[PDB]
Amino acid sequence: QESVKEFLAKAKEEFLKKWESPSQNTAQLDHFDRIKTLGTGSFGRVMLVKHKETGNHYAMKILDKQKVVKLKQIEHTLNEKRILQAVNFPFLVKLEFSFKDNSNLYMVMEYVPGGEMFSHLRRIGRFSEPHARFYAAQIVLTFEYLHSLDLIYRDLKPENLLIDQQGYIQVTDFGFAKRVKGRTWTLCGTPEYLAPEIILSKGYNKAVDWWALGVLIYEMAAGYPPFFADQPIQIYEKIVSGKVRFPSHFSSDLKDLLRNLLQVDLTKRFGNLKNGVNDIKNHKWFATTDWIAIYQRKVEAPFIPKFKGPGDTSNFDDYEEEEIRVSINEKCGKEFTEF
Numbered sequence: 001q002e003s004v005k006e007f008l009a010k011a012k013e014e015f016l017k018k019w020e021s022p023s024q025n026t027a028q029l030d031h032f033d034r035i036k037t038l039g040t041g042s043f044g045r046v047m048l049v050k051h052k053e054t055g056n057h058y059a060m061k062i063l064d065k066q067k068v069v070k071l072k073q074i075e076h077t078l079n080e081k082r083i084l085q086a087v088n089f090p091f092l093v094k095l096e097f098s099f100k101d102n103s104n105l106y107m108v109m110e111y112v113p114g115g116e117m118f119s120h121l122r123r124i125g126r127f128s129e130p131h132a133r134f135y136a137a138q139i140v141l142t143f144e145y146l147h148s149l150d151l152i153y154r155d156l157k158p159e160n161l162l163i164d165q166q167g168y169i170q171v172t173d174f175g176f177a178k179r180v181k182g183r184t185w186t187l188c189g190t191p192e193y194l195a196p197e198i199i200l201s202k203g204y205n206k207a208v209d210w211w212a213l214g215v216l217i218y219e220m221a222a223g224y225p226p227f228f229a230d231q232p233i234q235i236y237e238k239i240v241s242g243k244v245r246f247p248s249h250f251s252s253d254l255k256d257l258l259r260n261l262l263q264v265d266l267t268k269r270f271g272n273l274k275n276g277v278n279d280i281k282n283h284k285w286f287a288t289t290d291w292i293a294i295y296q297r298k299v300e301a302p303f304i305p306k307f308k309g310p311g312d313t314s315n316f317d318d319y320e321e322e323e324i325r326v327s328i329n330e331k332c333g334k335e336f337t338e339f
Contacts, residue, residue, distance in 0.1 A: 008148045011088075015149045018086035019179075024339070027097035027108060029326070032060065035311070037319040043067035045324075048111060048313055057310045058096060059112070062324060063105040065332040073175075074335050076188075080174040081107060081339055089145045090297060091138045093162065093172040100339050102330045112170050114163035114305030115315030121158055126223035129251060130288075131302040135161070136217050137286065137294045138169040143213065144277045147206045152180050156212035157190050158219065167301025180205065191232045192225040196240045196264045210271030210280070214261025221254060222247050226262065240264065253285040 035048040035057075044063040051058065068077050084095040084107065097108040117135065121127065127135075139156070146153055154176035162170045176188045183203030195211035197204040218226045226245075227238035242264045246255050260270040260279075270279045281291060293299050307315055 008145070011145060012149055014088065015086050019082065022082050022338075023085050023098070025099050027099050027106075029099070029101065029106065032058070032108075034324075036313050036316075037321055038313065038316045040319050043071050043073065045319075045322075047324075048311070049108070050311070057111045059093075059109045061107040061109065063107075065100075065103060065105060065336060068105070069332055069335060076175055076178075076186075077105060078336070078338060079176075079178050081105070083151060083177050083179070084109075084174050087146075087149070087151075089142060090295060091142045091169050091171055093170045098339070100336060101326050103325065103327045105336065105339055109172070110170070111310065112162035112164050112172075113307045113310060113312050113315060114165065114167075116159050117161040117163060117169070118158035119315065119317075120163065120303065120305070121220060121223070127220045128302075129221055129254060129285075132217055132220035133286065133289065134294075134299065134302055135169055135220065136213070137289045137291065139171075139213055139216065140277065140280055140286075141291065141295055142169075142171055143206075143209050143271075146177075147209070147277070150179050150181050151177055152184065152206050153177050153209050154189055156209065156216055157193050158216065163303070163305050165305070165307075166297060167304045168297055191235045192219075192227060194236070194239060195266070197266055199236045199239055204266070205272075207266045207269050207272035210261055210269055211263075211266075213271075214258050217254075217261070218244075218258055221250060226258075251285070253283070257283050257285040 031053070032049040032051055035050055037045055038048055038059060039046040044061060047060045047062060049058050049060045050056070063077055068074060081098055085098065093112065094110045095107060096110060099106050143153065153174075155173055160171060160173045162172055164170050178184060183205055185203050187198060187201070189198060193212045193215045195204065195208040198208055215225055227235050229235045229238060244258070244262055246258070257270070263269040266272060270283075271277055273279055280286070290299070305315060
């Protein structure tokens with residue numbers, strides 16, 4: 001379809017202009033008030049903040065440089081910020097500012113008060129197929145965009161999909177995203193969502209994203225992931241076995257799509273064939289989907305999150321509120337010169 005081809009051609013031109021000349025140092029810490037911790041990790045946290053002069057709310061991701069080094073995440077964190085400042089798509093959380101100081105790296109992103117899809121899925125149990133399909137279509141379009149820029153996302157899971165005020169998806173966390181024209185080799189991702197070729201330490205490509213879409217659709221529609229087990233070693237054994245059990249309430253169209261996304265042979269997997277993403281968009285399971293209407297956000301969402309305003313944190317959970325310090329001396333300056 002020429003209009004989609006010309007859209008993606010323009011999208012790539014605009015990405016490459018920002019990719020080759022990244023923005024840096026577009027804000028500073030004392031322009032923001034700290035409100036609440038929204039999430040915590042091994043080397044970073046995400047905070048709700050308020051801009052002092054405008055009053056706007058943002059989500060500020062803060063990474064400790066010394067911990068990033070020790071956890072061997074230097075290239076990944078440079079990847080995350082260079083990609084985020086260059087992309088632009090309706091279902092990607094927008095990066096608004098970035099900066100660094102003696103101790104930390106900061107990415108100030110749009111705040112999505114509806115919270116994670118994971119919380120809503122776990123509250124309700126499972127999504128109906130139309131509800132799962134509405135979200136799945138947004139991920140298909142987002143991966144079509146990212147893959148046309150030669151980007152692999154590599155972190156699809158329900159926790160990284162936030163629900164906005166219109167009930168649409170906003171994808172967050174580009175920590176494992178990478179520009180890859182051929183193969184790449186890093187072991188990363190959450191265990192339930194890893195493709196077999198990652199587990200087997202092969203050189204892999206963008207088809208691992210389409211495998212992960214299969215896992216996400218299964219989990220949305222069933223309430224649990226297809227290769228679930230108590231320990232990661234058992235999860236990995238199931239992933240590479242080539243078998244998967246479908247609930248009887250799954251439609252025949254859903255089972256057929258999932259068999260082709262959860263295809264252990266990457267050269268036979270939907271999204272990685274000669275027709276590319278069109279094998280997915282043309283599948284019978286998506287016959288009711290108006291792809292342009294999804295992109296333009298003209299479809300009524302199945303669910304509108306409940307929240308009181310742009311500063312409401314009730315859809316996120318509670319964490320110990322810990323100090324964020326900035327050392328008198330510069331740490332790891334050379335490693336993060338380009339940030």
